Every structure is written in C-alpha cells, then in structure tokens.
Design a protein around this nucleic acid. Structure first.
Ligand SMILES: [Mg+2]
Ligand SMILES: [Mg+2]
Ligand SMILES: [Mg+2]
Ligand SMILES: [Mg+2]
Ligand SMILES: [Mg+2]
Ligand SMILES: [Mg+2]
Ligand SMILES: [Mg+2]
Ligand SMILES: [Mg+2]
Ligand SMILES: [Mg+2]
Ligand SMILES: [Mg+2]
Ligand SMILES: [Mg+2]
Ligand SMILES: [Mg+2]
Ligand SMILES: [Mg+2]
Ligand SMILES: [Mg+2]
Ligand SMILES: [Mg+2]
Ligand SMILES: [Mg+2]
Ligand SMILES: [Mg+2]
Ligand SMILES: [Mg+2]
Ligand SMILES: [Mg+2]
Ligand SMILES: [Mg+2]
Ligand SMILES: [Mg+2]
Ligand SMILES: [Mg+2]
Ligand SMILES: [Mg+2]
Ligand SMILES: [Mg+2]
Ligand SMILES: [Mg+2]
Ligand SMILES: [Mg+2]
Ligand SMILES: [Mg+2]
Ligand SMILES: [Mg+2]
Ligand SMILES: [Mg+2]
Ligand SMILES: [Mg+2]
Ligand SMILES: [Mg+2]
Ligand SMILES: [Mg+2]
Ligand SMILES: [Mg+2]
Ligand SMILES: [Mg+2]
Ligand SMILES: [Mg+2]
Ligand SMILES: [Mg+2]
Ligand SMILES: [Mg+2]
Ligand SMILES: [Mg+2]
Ligand SMILES: [Mg+2]
Ligand SMILES: [Mg+2]
Ligand SMILES: [Mg+2]
Ligand SMILES: [Mg+2]
Ligand SMILES: [Mg+2]
Ligand SMILES: [Mg+2]
Lengths: 59, 98, 171, 71, 108, 53, 94
RNA sequence: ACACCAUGG
RNA sequence: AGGAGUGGAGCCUGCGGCUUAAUUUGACCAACACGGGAAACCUCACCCGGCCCGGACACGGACAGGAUUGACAGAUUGAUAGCUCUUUCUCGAUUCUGUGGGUGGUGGUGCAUGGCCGUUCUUAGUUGGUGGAGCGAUUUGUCUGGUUAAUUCCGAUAACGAACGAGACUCUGGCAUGCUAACUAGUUACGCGACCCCCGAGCGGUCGGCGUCCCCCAACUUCUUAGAGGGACAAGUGGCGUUCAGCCACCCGAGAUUGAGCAAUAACAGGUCUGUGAUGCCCUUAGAUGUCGGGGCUGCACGCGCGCUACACUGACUGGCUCAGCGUGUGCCUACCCUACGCCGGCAGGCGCGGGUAACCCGUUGAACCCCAUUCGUGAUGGGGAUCGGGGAUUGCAAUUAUUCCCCAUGAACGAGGAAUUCCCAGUAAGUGCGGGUCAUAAGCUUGCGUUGAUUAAGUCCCUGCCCUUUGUACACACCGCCCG
C-alpha cells in the first residue's frame, strides 16, 4: 500500500512530497489431518500480531 | 420544550445503570445509535449531559468527535433521588477488579 | 458482511483503532504517567494493556477507574459485552520513556517553576537513569512578548540515518 | 462579517393568545352534562380531547396534519 | 517598488475601504507642493494654505504626493500650521465630491 | 419549529469529513482512511505507514 | 415535479382571477429550473436572479426553454480605465 | 596590455 | 558542445486590472495547474432574502381556571417556514421574562504563539572540556603541503582527548540451473484422450507437425513467487605517487562511478489562526459573524505564468498484424465498487444472468507509438481542429451561464516563431500509451509504471552562484550599506 502526500500544510514553499507505504506478507500451509489435531497445533505459540486463519476444506 | 419527560428519564436510567456514557459529536443523527434508540435523538443526549455537567455530577472527556461522560458520587446521589430508587442499589460497577 | 473486509482495509482499520485508543488514553491518564498501550488480541478475548508510572491512580479505588475505562472502550468501539479486558502495568526505568518525562515536565511547568530549573531537573533525571544522551527543547514566550527557544543538550545524540528509528525516543 | 443595519419590520413571535382555561362542558343539572363541541372519533386520540368549534371547519389539535371536517 | 524587504508588516492592502468625514477643528486640504524635512505646502479647501507636517504615524508608511486630497487637523493657537491626519484615495475623493463635502474647486 | 433542517447530502465533499479534525478539504479516501491530509501525516506512524522510499 | 407543482397551481388560477382582455399580474418565484410547458403560455412571471424578480411575458416561442434563461444574473460589462497593477510597465511610487 | 557598469520604502 | 524546447498561433488553467449586489480569500530565486483549490446544490468563507436556539448554570419574577409546545383551514410568502395575520384546539413543568454568566465563530492579528513545512544551503560545515596566547572582545585545537565527492584521509604540530554533520545505515535495480517449496504459479514428460490438416518418410495408419483442447494421487522448480545465505574489497596485474594517503589503465566478472530515504549548529519578523476539541488577546453573540432558497467564485478593452494541440510526405487516412509494467476493486457514519458473457441499438447506451473482499474473477491485463499494405500529392490540401447550428444518451434532488459522452454540419489562427529564457549525461532527453489521487458525473493537472530510444561531454571558471585562505573597509538595519556639494 502506498500513499504519496504533500509534505506541507498551507500550500507554500518548494513542492516536496512524502511517500509512505505499508507491506503485507502472506503465507499458507496445507495439512491432511483430523480437525482436532489442527486446533491443537494452531492455537499455540502465536507471539506477534500475525494473523492465523484456519479453513476446513480447500482441496 | 427541550425534551419530553420520557427522554430525560430514558437518558438518566441508562447513565445510572451503566455509570458511563459515550456519544458521537453529531447534532443530526436522528436516533442515539443503539443505546436509547427508542426515538431519542443524539442531540438530546449531549444537551442533557451538558446541563448535567454544568452542575458537577459528571466528568467529561473528548477525543476524535466523541464525548465520554463519567458519573460521580454527587451524581450518583442526585440520580438516586431523581429516579426514586431504593436508597441502596447501583448496578453500575461493584466488584474487586483483580 | 457475509464475506468479511479485505486484508488491506483490515490492517488499515486495525491501525486507526490503535491510534484512536492511544489518543484517548493519552488525553486522560496524562496526570498518571501514561506511556503506551499494547493491544494483544488473545483467544476468545481482546486484551488491552496500559503501561504507566502510577498504577494505583490508573485503577483507583477498588478499580473504579479501570472499570469505567473498560466500559467506555466497550461502548465506543462496538465490542460484544464481555470481550474487552483491560490491564494496568508498571514501566521499569521510567527515566528512559520520553513521553513520561515530557508530561512530567509539562505538569511541573504548569504548576510554577523556573523553566531552566525544571529542564535541568529533568535532564539530571534522564541522564542519571542511564542514557547515552538527552535533549530537551522549550519554545514559546519565555520571559517577554517575543517568542524564543531554549535547548538543553547532554551526552551523545544522533540525528541522521536509519539508526534513529530505534535508539531514540521523541515526545 | 460586518455589522447589521436597522431593519423595517423585525418582530419575533406571536404571544400565545390567553384564552380562559376550560369551559368545554355545561350542565342541564348536576350529573346531567352537555358538550358544546364533539369529541373526535380518532384511534390515536383517547376519545377525551375536543375539537375546535370552527364553523365551516372542524379542527382537532392532536392530529395536527389531517382529520378536519369541512362543515 | 521591489526590494529584499520581506521583513516588516508584509501587506496592508484590501479591496474594502470605509469613509471618514470631518470633525471639530479638522478640515480637508489639497497638497500644493512638496518641501523637504517631511514638511509640505497645502491649501485648505476654503481659505488659508496652512503649511502642514506629516505626523509620526504616517512617516514612510503611507506616502503623499503632490496634488491630492487630504484630511488635516487644524491647530487652535497657531493658524498657518497643521498636521496631516489622513489621506483620501481617488475613489473616496470622488465619493466626497458626490456627497458635497468638498467645495468642488479641486478635482481628481 | 421547522421541518426544513437538511437538504440531500449523499455525495460530494459536503457529504464527508475527517475522523479527527472534522474538516472537509483534502481527505484521504483510499483504503478507507477517511482522514485529512494533515491529520494523516500526524498519525501515520501509529497507523503503520513507514517512510523508506 | 415535487413542489414545482403548486407553481402550476398559481400560474393557473391566476389567469381566471384576471379580467378578460388583460393579463395575469405576477407569479414571482425562485424556480429558475422550470421548463416551459405550453400551458404557461400567456401568463406573466417574475423570475428571481439573486436580488430581483425581473418580469417575463411568456410567448409561444419559449416552449421547452428554462424560465431561468430569461433573467440574467449579472450586468453586461463596459470597461473603465486600467489601474496601477495592469502592466509590468507600472510599479513605482515614493 | 583596462568599452560601458548611476541610484536605493 | 548539443538536444528538446518555451517566448510567436488556437485553446486549458492560475495571478493582476477592469466590471459588479458579490465577482470571498491567502501567497509576489523561496507567489501565479500552489492552498490537493478540476466550486452546478453541498463545499462556502461572498452577495440578496427567510425560519431557528442548538442562550449551560445561578438568582429573582410570573405559574397547575395552569408556565409553556405544536398545528387544520383563508389571507401571506420562493416556500406545504403556524414566519406573520384571522380562528382556538392540543401539550404539560421539560419552558418563558429579566439580571449576571456562558457558548459558538472558514471573525481580526502568522509582527503575540505551539506544531508542521519551506529556505538560507546540497554544500562541508559546527561545538564544548582541560592545557597555551591576549587586560579584553577573542584565538589555538578546526593546519604549510599532498589527497578526496567530503573538516575524507596522510601527515605537520601548543595542543591532548571527544561530540554532531559526511561516511557507515534503510529501501531499491543488476547476478545464483547452488538451498528452502508451491493445483491461488508453472515446465517437461508421457498416461494420455481428442481435433485438424499431409505439411514428412509413409497411406491417411506407425513415426512425426500445431494447441491458453481435456486429464495425471506423473517427475521436477529452468521460467513465476519469496525467504535464508553468497557475492565487490580498489581484491589481482602494469604505470604514476615524498613510493604514505591515493590516481590512471587492463584481465576476470552479473557488476569496477544504479536510484532514492534519513541529515548538523545558527537563523528568517518566510508560509500557515482557512487542517485541529492546538492556542493568548480583541470583536460579535438572538435585528448573530452559529441554517434553508436564489446568485457568485467562470463576468472581459487589456498585461503576465505553468501547459495541451499543431504548423504535415521522417505525414494524414483506411485496413491487417503483434508485444507491457506499477496499481485499484463491493464503504461501519457515508450506500457508491471492478467487470465477464448472451441479447438489443450506427453510436453513446439499455436489458438479462454469473465471478471476485482477490497470485483464485475482470486478466494470458489482445494498450499506444512502432511493423505491413491501400488512397492522397506541395495546393492553408484529405495538414490543423478553434468557433458555431440541429439531434440522441447517461449521472443527479436540479445541467440555463452549453457537467460529461455520441452523431451530421460549419472549417478560424497557424507554413517553425523578435528581444529574451528553462530543463537535461545513458535505458537519461524526447516520442508513446497505462494506472493512483480528486471522483454521484469528469483530466489539457499532478503522482507512479512500463514501451521505442538518439545527437553531444568526460571539461572549465568566462557568465550566474557556492566553499576555504590572505588582504582592504569611513559597512554592522551589514553594498538593496554609507555618504558629498
Ligand atoms: Mg554520524
Ligand atoms: Mg547518510
Ligand atoms: Mg548595480
Ligand atoms: Mg538620485
Ligand atoms: Mg542621493
Ligand atoms: Mg537605505
Ligand atoms: Mg511543442
Ligand atoms: Mg473543459
Ligand atoms: Mg476574480
Ligand atoms: Mg536556492
Ligand atoms: Mg467542475
Ligand atoms: Mg455555493
Ligand atoms: Mg472563544
Ligand atoms: Mg475554528
Ligand atoms: Mg512566521
Ligand atoms: Mg511559524
Ligand atoms: Mg581557555
Ligand atoms: Mg589568560
Ligand atoms: Mg577557530
Ligand atoms: Mg578534489
Ligand atoms: Mg594524522
Ligand atoms: Mg581530533
Ligand atoms: Mg597498484
Ligand atoms: Mg570481460
Ligand atoms: Mg548511492
Ligand atoms: Mg542541514
Ligand atoms: Mg495553524
Ligand atoms: Mg486566534
Ligand atoms: Mg483554504
Ligand atoms: Mg451548519
Ligand atoms: Mg447556500
Ligand atoms: Mg477560482
Ligand atoms: Mg508551478
Ligand atoms: Mg504527439
Ligand atoms: Mg495520467
Ligand atoms: Mg474509479
Ligand atoms: Mg481519473
Ligand atoms: Mg491541482
Ligand atoms: Mg538560469
Ligand atoms: Mg572548499
Ligand atoms: Mg580582515
Ligand atoms: Mg555603525
Ligand atoms: Mg550603492
Ligand atoms: Mg543631499
């Protein structure tokens, strides 16, 4: 995601800009196992603000 | 005729039973969002709490278009008088918040 | 919706939520040494943590203030009742949190004190707690009708490069 | 953002004409009431509110947007 | 006239202006000719010429060139002397001419 | 009283305003920020936009 | 046609209160965006321009124009004399 | 082996 | 030294002036396609009318035959504003009157301020501790010389030991047939199966040739994705260097000098009170400077700035052919997103049914210039597309002063631009199209992306400026100074 804004309020001066950007990384894992073991292993050791989504049938 | 009596009551009973209120700084939202949504306008909530603040009874904060109002001991007493409640009952907050 | 929001909007909305909560808790716990929130969305619950220097002032009498805070945070951001759970905590080595010192100096100056005395007191404290350097500026109408600025530097201080995104705290 | 100048007519509001309070009933005898104006057959109205004696008109002040009888 | 003088109160011009009339011991005048030392020769719109002095408030902030309408405050004790209080622009001078303020002997 | 207290406001910049300052000019609508171009530059570090171009 | 209706009720009902061999007086309005239906032929209207209700006598040639297209919102300009900033040839004062 | 180059709310 | 130009023409847009009820306003290298400022309503601050209180709280006054609220009908009004007037029902202590006091303000002051930004100033510049010199302001350290893009280093040394800025640092572009591992990406293989043509030997079959035709619980990661490591260090070799710091050339190589972000002390009466529930003081506060309807911000003798399209044959027109990359996409208040495919219509566009919250659908993003063939023929012409007439659609509550789009017609200046002046060193200038921002509607703007791809330099201090040393000064508000008759 990119946002390029003017650097100043008020519209005076040399016309400089600021370029902010956010980066979103995504990974997926696929397992063939009973759902109970999936809920067993997926709900442990989630330290940072990473997302973890589980879907029951994708193959 | 600022507010029908129905509305003064329907604000004060909510402020007493919760002990706190929030309201978007909007004078055109025709219904307070879910709290008090029985045809009470957002305008009436903020105009009522304004008066309630001008006499103590309440503390007010504001950040990004939203008022936050806390009750006080004087306010607890005034609302216990005004709504004719048992002289010892308050569902707002009573627990050892461990 | 039947299909939930997209990832971009989701992350932007998370950031806006955190910013608004931090602003709200800044405007309130100033006199109690507020120094940052840590939203930790845990299984079955949304937990918010408030670091501060005077925790008794944060929770209050039997926890009236902290329960009022949970109440407002649950009313305004639309959470299902019972989800938002709030904790207070004490920050170790308060002399190195810039926001704490900034608000302390703001209230020490709002209560009447020679601005040089106050700035040198906070400089002493910040350098004594263990810190490669500090720098405190005060700008405005100090002693007159024409504005000025007064800067008190101490120790080592860097201004340029990437190592400034860490290694410095600004308030 | 400049000051206002002297007007020609300015006047705020009517003065709520002060009619006597309540003389809508008359007795032929004590406990034999008569009613000068008819009570409005309305559902929202509790059948206790009266109508204006507005000959060429019949006006119920409760239903302030409808239910007027023209005779 | 252009200069490095961005300093000083920058810009004191507007498309709006409001009139000011005569008062007690205060007349109009027309600049007859320029002298040195900030002084001036003038002519009250009725009688005497009444050599004038540009007061401390007007010095180098509002300039006065020859042959223009001005509003000067007369001195009681002295007669031939006065102090330039205000300047009248062309549109306001013609406005005064319309309201009949100045005896129309001098034109704009 | 009155029953003339609003005329249709569903679109245009009379329809929308900043989350923070409540101003109408220079809003950012991308990704659902809905935030003034000045208010953003102030809170962008809390939101999570880092400047490393 | 909203409460652009009711203007038709005073365009009409003003040509029947009028004595024959004469014209209705003025149905003065703010409604600049009215189209001209052939009913409105003949009547006199006063069409507001921002300060004044300039009057118009509707002719059968204006059918399907806008009532606003018959009272202008500004004065057609005659120029004065160019002032102090009008050219780069002009700057100096003491 | 050296053209002209004055003045400042 | 050159390239493309700009200044000349038509139009777009901003600033001055003129005009006006009003044409709201800030800003004059470092204002003028800047205030995301592409304003129909709204925005909105301007002009012209009309309702409202959303005037807390305290005190006093009137007040439950009662304070006070709201409204039907006729007149009135732009108005279906009970605005006012005639008439008199309804509400119920919430008000109303008066005195204090608050409140709001795109009201004033940016020369009262915070914060942010711009600029001095893109260069190499700055500072204190102890010691030395001077009565002192001050000075040395911070340098004769060599070197560097660099107060970068070598060295010299009344200084020693340090701090900031430079550098280091972060993102990015170039390379890995080595690692990690993938039906939300592919390759190859054949299991295949099928279509098609002999196009080859042959028969046409077997062998082959084309396939974004269908399958694999096939094997793999070359192309795609994205993580971890690797790799460049003036390291090797030859010259020039007090043989030191370093400079030039060359072999090997994906490369021997990609591009940006961040940035110091000191300062400016630079810009911003119109980003702010940042803010001091002054002003106004019910006949409002706090809301609805209408007009303006667009008006046109003229002066100026940034730009778009052209002046044609290295072209225009009409067909055919064949290649991208960076992105965005259903909205909480706020109600609208990107589109496939069938049908209908010359066209803009309409109807009907599906996919997508996205490496999944639009999409294998059939982009333009370019490439290949027709017609034109030096003629203001089939170059150019201003101005204007008539008709048809869509967005919207509303299109007139034409919002935007489509169709037939009218067919202006302009034949390379005076004095002046801007930007630029390699995947760069220029040509060319595509996305994001604003966006109910909509780019001649800006912010990013690819595609085709040159001429000219490897220098100097002449012009305009900048840095360091020596020197002169009657300047210090600092030459835009001072000053004589
Ligand atoms: Mg450094
Ligand atoms: Mg650096
Ligand atoms: Mg000179
Ligand atoms: Mg001279
Ligand atoms: Mg002189
Ligand atoms: Mg001078
Ligand atoms: Mg050109
Ligand atoms: Mg246009
Ligand atoms: Mg104008
Ligand atoms: Mg410069
Ligand atoms: Mg427009
Ligand atoms: Mg408007
Ligand atoms: Mg105020
Ligand atoms: Mg304001
Ligand atoms: Mg300033
Ligand atoms: Mg400033
Ligand atoms: Mg010393
Ligand atoms: Mg000494
Ligand atoms: Mg020195
Ligand atoms: Mg060099
Ligand atoms: Mg050395
Ligand atoms: Mg050293
Ligand atoms: Mg060598
Ligand atoms: Mg080689
Ligand atoms: Mg580099
Ligand atoms: Mg700097
Ligand atoms: Mg400001
Ligand atoms: Mg102010
Ligand atoms: Mg503005
Ligand atoms: Mg309003
Ligand atoms: Mg309006
Ligand atoms: Mg404009
Ligand atoms: Mg420009
Ligand atoms: Mg072209
Ligand atoms: Mg574009
Ligand atoms: Mg779009
Ligand atoms: Mg667009
Ligand atoms: Mg623009
Ligand atoms: Mg130049
Ligand atoms: Mg130098
Ligand atoms: Mg000297
Ligand atoms: Mg001196
Ligand atoms: Mg001189
Ligand atoms: Mg002299």
């Amino acid at each position: 995601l990119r946002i390029t804004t003017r650097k100043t309020p008020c519209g005076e001066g040399s016309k400089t800009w600021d370029r902010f950007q956010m980066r979103i990384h995504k990974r997926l894992i696929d397992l063939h196992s009973p759902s109970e073991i999936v809920k067993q292993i997926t709900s442990i050791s989630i330290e940072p603000g990473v997302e973890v989504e589980v879907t029951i049938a994708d193959a | 005729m600022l507010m029908p009596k129905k509305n003064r009551i329907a604000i004060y009973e909510l402020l007493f039973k919760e002990g706190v209120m929030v309201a978007k700084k909007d004078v055109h939202m025709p219904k307070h969002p879910e709290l008090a949504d029985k045809n009470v306008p957002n305008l009436h909530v903020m105009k009522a709490m304004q008066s309630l603040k001008s006499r103590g009874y309440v503390k007010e904060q504001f950040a990004w278009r939203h008022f936050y109002w806390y009750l006080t001991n004087e306010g607890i007493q005034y609302l216990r008088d005004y709504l004719h409640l048992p002289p010892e009952i308050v569902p707002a907050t009573l627990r050892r918040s461990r | 919706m039947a299909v939930q929001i997209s990832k971009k909007r989701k992350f932007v909305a998370d950031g806006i939520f955190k910013a608004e909560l931090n602003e709200f808790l800044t405007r309130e716990l100033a006199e109690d040494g507020y120094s940052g929130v840590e939203v930790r969305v845990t299984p079955t619950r949304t937990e918010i943590i408030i670091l501060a220097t005077r925790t008794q002032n944060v929770l209050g009498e039997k926890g009236r203030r902290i329960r009022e805070l949970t109440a407002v945070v649950q009313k305004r951001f639309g959470f299902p009742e019972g989800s938002v759970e709030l904790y207070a905590e004490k920050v170790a080595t308060r002399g190195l949190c810039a926001i704490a010192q900034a608000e302390s100096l703001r209230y020490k100056l709002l209560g009447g004190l020679a601005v040089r005395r106050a700035c040198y007191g906070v400089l002493r404290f910040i350098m004594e707690s263990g810190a490669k350097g500090c720098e405190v500026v005060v700008s405005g109408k100090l002693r007159g009708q024409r504005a000025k600025s007064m800067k008190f530097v101490d120790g080592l201080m860097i201004h340029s490069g990437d190592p400034v995104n860490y290694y410095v705290d600004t308030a | 953002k400049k000051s206002y100048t002297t007007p020609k007519k300015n006047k705020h509001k009517r003065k709520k004409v002060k009619l006597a309070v309540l003389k809508y009933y008359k007795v032929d005898e004590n406990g034999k009431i008569s009613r000068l104006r008819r009570e409005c057959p309305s559902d929202e109205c509790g059948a206790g509110v009266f109508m204006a004696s507005h000959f060429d008109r019949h006006y119920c002040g409760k239903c302030c947007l409808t239910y007027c009888f023209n005779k | 006239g252009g200069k490095n003088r961005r300093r000083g109160k920058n810009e004191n011009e507007s498309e709006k202006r409001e009139l000011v009339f005569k008062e007690d011991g205060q007349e109009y005048a027309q600049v007859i000719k320029m002298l040195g030392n900030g002084r001036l020769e003038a002519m009250c719109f009725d009688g005497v010429k009444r050599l004038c002095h540009i007061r401390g408030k007007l010095r180098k902030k509002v300039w006065i060139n020859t042959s223009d309408i001005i509003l000067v405050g007369l001195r009681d004790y002295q007669d031939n002397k006065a102090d330039v209080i205000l300047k009248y622009n062309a549109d306001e001078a013609r406005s005064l001419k319309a309201y009949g303020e100045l005896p129309e002997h001098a034109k704009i | 009283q009155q029953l003339y207290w609003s005329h249709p406001r569903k679109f245009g910049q009379g329809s929308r305003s900043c989350r923070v300052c409540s101003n109408r000019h220079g809003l950012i609508r991308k990704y659902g920020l809905n935030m003034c171009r000045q208010c953003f530059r102030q809170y962008a570090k809390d939101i999570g936009f880092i400047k490393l171009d | 046609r909203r409460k652009q209706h009711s203007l038709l009720k005073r365009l009409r009902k003003a040509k029947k209160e009028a004595p024959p061999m004469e014209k209705p007086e003025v149905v003065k309005t703010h409604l600049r965006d009215m189209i001209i239906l052939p009913e409105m032929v003949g009547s006199m209207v006063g069409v507001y321009n921002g300060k004044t209700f300039n009057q118009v006598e509707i002719k059968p040639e204006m059918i399907g124009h806008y009532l606003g297209e018959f009272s202008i919102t500004y004065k057609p300009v005659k120029h004065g004399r160019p002032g102090i900033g009008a050219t780069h040839s002009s700057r100096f004062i003491p």
